[PDB]
Amino acid sequence: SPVAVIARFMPRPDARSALRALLDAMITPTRAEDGCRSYDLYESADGGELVLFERYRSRIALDEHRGSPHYLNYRAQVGELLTRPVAVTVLAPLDEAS
């Protein structure tokens, strides 16, 4: 049933701070979603991308996240900060210990 997402963000150099702020504001409300198992934020070693790794209980839970007030606000603003669109990969677990 459960699902995960990798989302990769390549900010414009002048928009890195704004991107970090936008993603920072997602963490609390997203982790508070009934169907969110985890939601973690990283920077690539080469510093070129911020990466979110997200895990949800079901496809329904992921749909709900994508309709949430916090998500909608983020989605309204994120595109304008990036060199290219968010690279999103939805995942289905094959062997996830938890």
Added chain:
Amino acid sequence: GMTSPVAVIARFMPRPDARSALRALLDAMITPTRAEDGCRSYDLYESADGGELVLFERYRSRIALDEHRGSPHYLNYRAQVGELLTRPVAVTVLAPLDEAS
């Protein structure tokens, strides 16, 4: 720094005929890698579109990742993986900014 936790995303794009072989190769990594003192997690997924297999790995330190990369299981895997794929493994090393316990 070197004592700080790290994560790794590794993406694999098998040839269609090699998919079950790749799954078996990656499966064999799971028990010994999770057993590493320094491995926090090591989880296998497939992409929603079925084209990729993806490992998400978390290590207690960069040192632990280096230990992983020197291990007998890793070296066996490294010797064989490329031959199953349409392109080399796509590997990203990650530094946590906000990773919950």
